[PDB]
Design a protein around this nucleic acid. Structure first.
Ligand SMILES: [Mg+2]
Ligand SMILES: [Mg+2]
Ligand SMILES: [Mg+2]
Ligand SMILES: [Mg+2]
Ligand SMILES: [Mg+2]
Ligand SMILES: [Mg+2]
Ligand SMILES: [Mg+2]
Ligand SMILES: [Mg+2]
Lengths: 201, 258, 167
RNA sequence: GGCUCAGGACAACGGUUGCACCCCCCGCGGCGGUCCUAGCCGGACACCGCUGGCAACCCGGCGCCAAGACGUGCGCGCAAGGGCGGGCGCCCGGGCGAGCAGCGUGACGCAGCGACGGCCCGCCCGGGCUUCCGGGGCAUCACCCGGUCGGCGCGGUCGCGGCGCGCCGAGGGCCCGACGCCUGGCGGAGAAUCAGGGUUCGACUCCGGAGAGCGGGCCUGCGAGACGGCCCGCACAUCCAAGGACGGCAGCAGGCGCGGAACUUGCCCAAUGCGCGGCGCGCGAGGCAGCGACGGGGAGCGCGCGAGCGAGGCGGGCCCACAGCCCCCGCCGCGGAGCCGAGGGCAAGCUGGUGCCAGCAGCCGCGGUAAUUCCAGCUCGGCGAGCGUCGCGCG
C-alpha cells in the first residue's frame, strides 16, 4: 500500500486520535525529518494549520520500529542489549540481533507517531481523567457496592518508631558489651603481651 | 567435570555406618551444611524415621519438624536434613525423652538417654587457635563454633565444656597422658581408653597409643582422639564401657539372643 | 579466548600433546592495561569483575603518587614528571608507560618545602635543591590502580646514575 | 538430574602428598564503633486505558500508580595496596617442622553497609592446580625438540608457572626404547574361564572424565567458555500474503536409514529424592503397568484299584494413586513334548527304495545291487520346556 497511519496524541489533556493520508506530495515536507523534529501542521489544512507537532516514532511497511540514533532511511540490524527499546528479554543477560527501521523519515513508512506541543487558538476534537490517585504519603501530602481506596505508603505510625528505637538500643548495648569484654580481657593478661587495634579518637 | 556443587546423593555411595538398605530406593538424603560434615554426621530424618519409628515417610517427618517438636542444643530445627553429630543433645519435650548422640563399639551413632543435671551442656574439641580481625584471639571447635577472648591456658586438642543456655566456657580438660579418651574415627571408633604414649613425627601425623581397661592396646592418629574427662568420664556412656568383643564372643551373644 | 593453560605446550621431551577438551573459563586472560603517564583529560581508572564477584581495578591514566624517603622518614604526595629508565625495554620508556620497577622523576617541591637545610643524606639534598628527584615504583598498576614508591639511595642510586649519566 | 563414548595414549584415570601460590552460594557460629527531610527522601518502568503497524515472528506512541526494585543517603575512622620496625656460628609465644601472622608509625585513597542494618571472619561441601608410583601396540619408526631447556624483569591470572612478552645463555629427551605412526582406544571398581600359576574383556548400574551437527566467541551469575542460554562461518532443514522469520532428540515415547541384531507415540507423583515453600505444588528423575524363549529359579503332563488333584471359568476379600498379578474363601471343572542322533570318536539296529546318480559327512569316511552312514517306516538313545546351527573368548 501507499499511505501513512498518522496517530495524534495530546499529552496536556490525554486525548489521542488517528487518520489516514493518501499522498506523498503533501508529506514531502515531512520527508527528511528525524525524531523530536518540529513539523508544522499547515501541511494538513484540515484544522491543523499553525500547530507545532513533534515526531516521536512510527512503523515501516513491514512493521519494523524506528530507532533514534542510527541516522538512516532504511532498516538495519544491531545487537540489542537489556533495557533497550524494541526488544523483550527472556534470560537475565541475553542479547538479540534484529532489524529496525532508520530514524530518518521517508516514503517507506506506514505509521507515524506524533505529539502536539504548541497549537493555535482553534480547538480540535483531538480534560485528563485520572484512573488512579497518588499512593505515597509525600505525594498526597503535596497534592491535597464497595468503597475501594489505595493503601497509603511511607506513613510512619507507632510501631515503626518502636522498631527503630529498639534497633538503636540493641546496637548500643551490643557495642557496650563488646567494650566491657575488651576491657576485662585487657585487665587480664597482666603478665603477657597483647596486640589489638587501638581505637582512634 | 561438574560445573557446580552437587546436590544429590546415590544410595550406594552413602556412608556405610548409616545402615541404609540397598533396595530402599535409588536416592538417599543429602545433608545440608552445618556444624558437622557429610562423613561425620547423620541426617535428622534417619533418626526420626528409621530409628525411633515415630514417622513412616518424609512428609510426616517434615510436619513434625515444622511443628517444632525437636530441639537440638535448645534451638528448634525445622530442616529434615540437618546434620547431627557426636556429643550432641537430642531432647523431645513432648515425650520427655532426652538423648545424647555418641558412638557404639561397632562404630555407629547411638542415642544415650541422659538426665537433666547434665543435659544443659556439651563437650567440644578445639582444633584451631587463630587471630581474627584486629588481632583478637579466637578458637574453633569440631562443631563449627567460634569463641572470642578465651583463656590463654587453653591450647589445641583440648576439651571444652560450654553451657548451652548461654554458650560460655566453664572448665577445660588438658590433653595429656593418663586422661580417659574416646575414639571418634577409623577402625577403633567407639572404644574408650587411656593415653599412654605420644609420639610425634616431624612433618607428618602424630600417633597416640592408649590402653583399654581390660588390658588391650591399640593405636590411632591424633586427629580423632577425643578427651571426655579426667580419669573418669565427664558424661554418660553406653552400657558397655567401650569394650569391643571378638567375633567368637559376638557369635555367642547372637546365639544366646536367638 | 586468551588462556594460560598448559595443554597447548609441548612436553619436556619436545613432543606435541593432544587436545582433549575445549577451552575453560578458569584459565582465561585479559589484555594489558598499559597505564600511561598523563604528563577530556584526567585520571581514569576502570573496574573489573573477577572470579567470585571480587573487584579489580586497572589504571589507564594517572599523574600523582605517594613517595617515601625511608632514611629520614619523610613521605609526601608528589607529581610524576616522566620515566627515565626501565630494565625491560626502551620502548616502554619512550612511551612513558608506568609499571612496577620503573624509574621516574618526581617534583621536588613537597620535599624542598621542608628539611632542605637539615643535615641528612647529602646525595638527596642536592637533588632537592634542583627540580626533580629520582624514584622507583613499588606498586602494581593494572591490579590496584595506584603508582606508589620510594626515593632511591645507597648502591642502587649509584647504579642507576651511572646507567643514565652518559646518555 | 538425565543421555552417549566421538575425541584424547608420560594425557584422562587409580592410590599417595600439598597450597607458607588459591576461589567458594546455601547452611551453622560469631562479629557488628563508618571522617568531611530520618515521625521516614526522589524519579521511573512493568501490568493496564487510548491509539497503531505486520502473512506470521514481533513490537511502536501518549497516559496517572507500588516496592524487601533503582538512586541519593543520617552514622563513635575504616576497604585494597605502599615505606620503615629481630639476629652476629646454629639450636634450646597467636602459631609452626619451618620469620609465619598480627600490630605500631609515616604517607595515599574514601571502597563496602545504612528509608524495617550487614559489610567482615571461621567451619562445611565443591572446585583449581600440584608431589611419588602405575598407566596399549609397531624398530620394514634410531635419533628427536628450537618457547624447545634454564636465568633475569614485567604483564596477566583467584593463584604458582615459558602462561605471554623483551634480554641472556645454551640446553633438554633417548635401546631401562625417545620421536613418529596405528588403534573396530574412555579409565577404574570389576566380568568370563578354572588344580596352582594364569589368559581375554571391561558401551552399560557406583566413581571420575569429555560432548551436545563441525569450528569458534560471549553475557548473566558465587558458580557455565552453558547449548531444552545468545552471536558468527560451514553443512543440512522449515513457513512465506516473497519483503521477511526460524531449528538443533548422544532426554522420554515414536519415525526413516543401516545392520545379523534390539520394546508402548501408556498411567502417576502414592513410595526414594530434588527445587520452592507452613498444613502443598512440580518433576518422561523415579514408580506402576504393557511387549519380552537375552537369561536365571521353582512345579507338571499321575498314583493305584478309588479317591484325589491341578490348569481353566464365575463371584467375594486382600493389595493397588486407579487397575492388575501373587495369596485366601466358595461353586463348576481339558492333563497337552519337542529337538538332535543310532559305523568310530560317542550312549543308542530290521524292512523298502536309489545305484560314485541324488545325497551324507566338524575328522576318519559312505554311496558303482544286503548301502549298519543317502531317502522313508518300525524300534531304540541323550537332554528336556527346552533342543539344535553360526561367530567370538577361556579351557
Ligand atoms: Mg559522611
Ligand atoms: Mg534502597
Ligand atoms: Mg574412539
Ligand atoms: Mg558418570
Ligand atoms: Mg558440557
Ligand atoms: Mg556451548
Ligand atoms: Mg542442560
Ligand atoms: Mg535437543
Amino acid at each position: 500500500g501507499s499511505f501513512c497511519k498518522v496517530n495524534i496524541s495530546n499529552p496536556v489533556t490525554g486525548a489521542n486520535k488517528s487518520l489516514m493520508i493518501e499522498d506523498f506530495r503533501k508529506s514531502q515536507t515531512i520527508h527528511g525529518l528525524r525524531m523530536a523534529s518540529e513539523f508544522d501542521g499547515a501541511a494538513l489544512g484540515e484544522e491543523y494549520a499553525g500547530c507545532t507537532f513533534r515526531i516521536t516514532g512510527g512503523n515501516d511497511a513491514q512493521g519494523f520500529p524506528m530507532y533514534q540514533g542510527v541516522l538512516k532511511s532504511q532498516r538495519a540490524r544491531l545487537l540489542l542489549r537489556q533495557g533497550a527499546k524494541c526488544y523483550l528479554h527472556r534470560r537475565n543477560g541475553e542479547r538479540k540481533r534484529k532489524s529496525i527501521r532508520g530514524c530518518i523519515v521517508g516514503p517507506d513508512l506506514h505509521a507515524l507517531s506524533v505529539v502536539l506541543v504548541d497549537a493555535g487558538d482553534k480547538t480540535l476534537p483531538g480534560v485528563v481523567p485520572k484512573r488512579l490517585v497518588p499512593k505515597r504519603a509525600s505525594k498526597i501530602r503535596r497534592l491535597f457496592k464497595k468503597l475501594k481506596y489505595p493503601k497509603v505508603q511511607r506513613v510512619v505510625t507507632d510501631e515503626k518508631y518502636a522498631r527503630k528505637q529498639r534497633v538503636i538500643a540493641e546496637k548500643k548495648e551490643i557495642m557496650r558489651k563488646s567494650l566491657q569484654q575488651l576491657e576485662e580481657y585487657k585487665a587480664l593478661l597482666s603478665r603477657m603481651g597483647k596486640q589489638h587495634n587501638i581505637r582512634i579518637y | 567435570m561438574a560445573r557446580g556443587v552437587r546436590k544429590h546423593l546415590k544410595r550406594l555411595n552413602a556412608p556405610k555406618h548409616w545402615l541404609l538398605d540397598k533396595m530402599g530406593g535409588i536416592w538417599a538424603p543429602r545433608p545440608t551444611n552445618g556444624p558437622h560434615g557429610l562423613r561425620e554426621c547423620i541426617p535428622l530424618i534417619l533418626i526420626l524415621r528409621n530409628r525411633l519409628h515415630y514417622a513412616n515417610t518424609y512428609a510426616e517427618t517434615s510436619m513434625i519438624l515444622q511443628d517444632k517438636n525437636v530441639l537440638i542444643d535448645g534451638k528448634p530445627r525445622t530442616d529434615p536434613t540437618f546434620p547431627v553429630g557426636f556429643m550432641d543433645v537430642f531432647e523431645i519435650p513432648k515425650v520427655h525423652k532426652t538423648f545424647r548422640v555418641l558412638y557404639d563399639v561397632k562404630g555407629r551413632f547411638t542415642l544415650v538417654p541422659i538426665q537433666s543435671n547434665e543435659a544443659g551442656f556439651k563437650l567440644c574439641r578445639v582444633q584451631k587457635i587463630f587471630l581474627g580481625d584486629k588481632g583478637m584471639p579466637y578458637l574453633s571447635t569440631h562443631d563449627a563454633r567460634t569463641i572470642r577472648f578465651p583463656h590463654p591456658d587453653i591450647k589445641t586438642n583440648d576439651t571444652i565444656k560450654i553451657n548451652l543456655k548461654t554458650g560460655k566456657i566453664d572448665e577445660w580438660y588438658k590433653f595429656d597422658i593418663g586422661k580417659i579418651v574416646m575414639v571418634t574415627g577409623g577402625r577403633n571408633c567407639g572404644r574408650i581408653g587411656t593415653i599412654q604414649a605420644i609420639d610425634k613425627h616431624m612433618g607428618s601425623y602424630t600417633m597416640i597409643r592408649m590402653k583399654d581397661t581390660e588390658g588391650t592396646e591399640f593405636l590411632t592418629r591424633l586427629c580423632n582422639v577425643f578427651v571426655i574427662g579426667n580419669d573418669s568420664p565427664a558424661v554418660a556412656i553406653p552400657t558397655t564401657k567401650g569394650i569391643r568383643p571378638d567375633i567368637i564372643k559376638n557369635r555367642e551373644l547372637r546365639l544366646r539372643s536367638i | 579466548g586468551i588462556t594460560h593453560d598448559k595443554m597447548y605446550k609441548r612436553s619436556k621431551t619436545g613432543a606435541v600433546q593432544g587436545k582433549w577438551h575445549k577451552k575453560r573459563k578458569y584459565n582465561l586472560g585479559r589484555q594489558p592495561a598499559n597505564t600511561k603517564l598523563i604528563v577530556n583529560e584526567g585520571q581514569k581508572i576502570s573496574t573489573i569483575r573477577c572470579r567470585g564477584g571480587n573487584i579489580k581495578r586497572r589504571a589507564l591514566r594517572l599523574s600523582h603518587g605517594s613517595f617515601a624517603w625511608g632514611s629520614a622518614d619523610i613521605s609526601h604526595k608528589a607529581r610524576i614528571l616522566q620515566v627515565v629508565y626501565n630494565s625491560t625495554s626502551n620502548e616502554l620508556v619512550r612511551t612513558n608507560t608506568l609499571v612496577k620497577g620503573c624509574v621516574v622523576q618526581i617534583d621536588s617541591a613537597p620535599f624542598k618545602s621542608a628539611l632542605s637545610n637539615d643535615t641528612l643524606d647529602k646525595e638527596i639534598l642536592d637533588q632537592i635543591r634542583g627540580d626533580h628527584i629520582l624514584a622507583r615504583i613499588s606498586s602494581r598498576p593494572g591490579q590496584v590502580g595506584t603508582a606508589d614508591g620510594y626515593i632511591l639511595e645507597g648502591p642502587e642510586l649509584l647504579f642507576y646514575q651511572k646507567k643514565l649519566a652518559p646518555k
